[PDB]
Symmetry: C2
Subunit: 159 residues, 2 copies
């Protein structure tokens, strides 16, 4: 677990969606979505379950204020990951509602998830290629601290 | 994938609860719960996402008519699995509703998930030991074809099937 906790990664799913994650500590992540259905969305201080399945394979799972459920597996040695995201129907129907700095709009997310339809869920299971991976250390509050913008991931990769 | 698809497994939690799964084909499972809060529940022809993450590590994920979301990992060579289940609030309060041959009560599951509370959800992540594992072959409709009963897991292990 000490090899995984503290990792800062960018990855592109096979559907082309580019995501950025920071494993801030053994039960918390920050993340930033750069493209795809909810590009522009970003989140800090998401509580998560993190386990090591076996040598080189980790699992990060959580549920969100929107109702979305997520289970990710990371294979850092192979620069691969796989994610399954279970979106409530309303998120698929109105992804714009969730596209914000979520921490400023928690009440809106919870209000929406009670007021709109949940079923059937829109489930997205895909592999992704890890294109950036760095051990950034634990509890660095500055890694993910602004909204995503065009070209940001190239900047991060360029150093 | 050909090592994993067709597997019939029982896995047992630390508390003794026994869960049974059959990887019927590369996008379908049957399952049967033998003990615990939803003992008696069983399901056929559940559509799933199955992938091989790396050598010896597989992932099976799906959402259910009850609204429950599931993502399991299997590590057959180490005889271990890890599951995370995201239960709607109502399944936590009325698990008995889900205890049945689900296929005969799809309408009830869907009525329930709309009528009762969804949130807050209960996220339940736990390892289990794989305590039975047998390649039963693909698309065998006879593996999970009846409701569970006390002693059935013993019969499965003793009959290798």
């Amino acid at each position: 677990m000490d090899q995984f906790v503290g990792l800062h990664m960018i990855y592109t799913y096979e559907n082309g969606w580019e995501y950025e994650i920071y494993i801030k500590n053994d039960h918390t992540i920050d993340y930033r979505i750069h493209s795809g259905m909810v590009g522009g969305r970003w989140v800090r201080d998401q509580e998560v379950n993190i386990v090591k399945l076996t040598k080189g394979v980790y699992k990060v799972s959580w549920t969100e204020p929107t109702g979305t459920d997520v289970s990710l597996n990371f294979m850092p040695e192979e620069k691969r990951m796989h994610g399954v995201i279970f979106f409530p129907k309303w998120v698929h129907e109105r992804p714009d509602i969730t596209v914000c700095y979520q921490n400023d709009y928690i009440d809106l997310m919870k209000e929406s998830r009670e007021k709109y339809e949940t079923y059937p869920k829109y489930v997205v299971p895909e592999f992704a290629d890890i294109t950036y991976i760095h051990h950034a250390g634990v509890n660095d509050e500055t890694i993910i601290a602004e909204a995503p913008y065009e070209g940001m991931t190239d900047e991060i990769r360029a150093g």
